[PDB]
Design a protein around this nucleic acid. Sequence first.
RNA 1: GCUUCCAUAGCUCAGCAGGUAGAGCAGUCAGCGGUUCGAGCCCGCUUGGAAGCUU
Length: 307
Amino acid sequence: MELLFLGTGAGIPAKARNVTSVALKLLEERRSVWLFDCGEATQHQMLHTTIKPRKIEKIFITHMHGDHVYGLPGLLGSRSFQGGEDELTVYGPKGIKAFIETSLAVTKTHLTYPLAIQEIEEGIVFEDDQFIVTAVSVIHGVEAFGYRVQEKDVPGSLKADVLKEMNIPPGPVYQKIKKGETVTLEDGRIINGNDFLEPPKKGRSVVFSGDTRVSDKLKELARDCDVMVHEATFAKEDRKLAYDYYHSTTEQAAVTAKEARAKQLILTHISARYQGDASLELQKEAVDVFPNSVAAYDFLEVNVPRG
RNA sequence: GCUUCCAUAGCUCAGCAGGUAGAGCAGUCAGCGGUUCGAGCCCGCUUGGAAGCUU
Ligand SMILES: [Zn+2]
Ligand SMILES: [Zn+2]
């Protein structure tokens, strides 16, 4: 589980930072990549990385603003052109279906893969045996969301040495014991799988805030998460600019991660006003409140470790 | 440059939901790391081959 930042810029693209797009690498977990917002030139940034368009399984959109969506028709089109076979699921607010379908029909684009566009609302957006994604409404003026990718608890390691010692040879019965199933051995021996299993390991959690003002709903959504990817468009000084433009400051994002009891905070959606040298100042403004703060820059890779 | 299939006893390609290597002849399963109880098979990356590259 890795977080590759493709775009850390707010509103209009800059030479330093391209517009918003964060990739959630799940190659070991599910052989795929999950995108969090797809602003213009996301595909272009992807050409300088190991992430391939065909590797994308689902794209989650926070809000309909152009710096988060204008990369969608190009990325979807290229995936089909690279020989895309597997399904792609676009999650977004009301308007995303109109935007994708119109931009693909007028351009005369026929996808070589199935496209599912789910117009989401506050609650569980996607759920299966491995992951559970929940969206929550955020303060931005326009219909905006905050996502949480929650990895469901994995079953504990097999006490294989215990089985080997008990004259149980390694074979296809080992995966059945790993599930906890009461197995009937070749020589007629009944054993409970759960007895030879270590305590289950707690799953990882990444939170993508999108564009938002200081929100209590976002604090609750990011409860005890491994990595909180919060937007910090402005600095501590530009507090009034943040309110009037429906955004958050470095200090505001740091207070949220502190109260949510998050392990790490990554500041994204940074204004073009602040340069490479000024980025450290923004990071230190957040570090004073929440120490494990990182001000994200283009092509930043952050690993999400397990417990 | 990109994206997709090939590299296994000096040499023909056999292999299976991943269960501890099956043959013709005078086994560092290309390297390394990871996932896993366990990797030829799964995920990375580094090497050597082949084929596509119109929104
Ligand atoms: Zn934005
Ligand atoms: Zn916005």
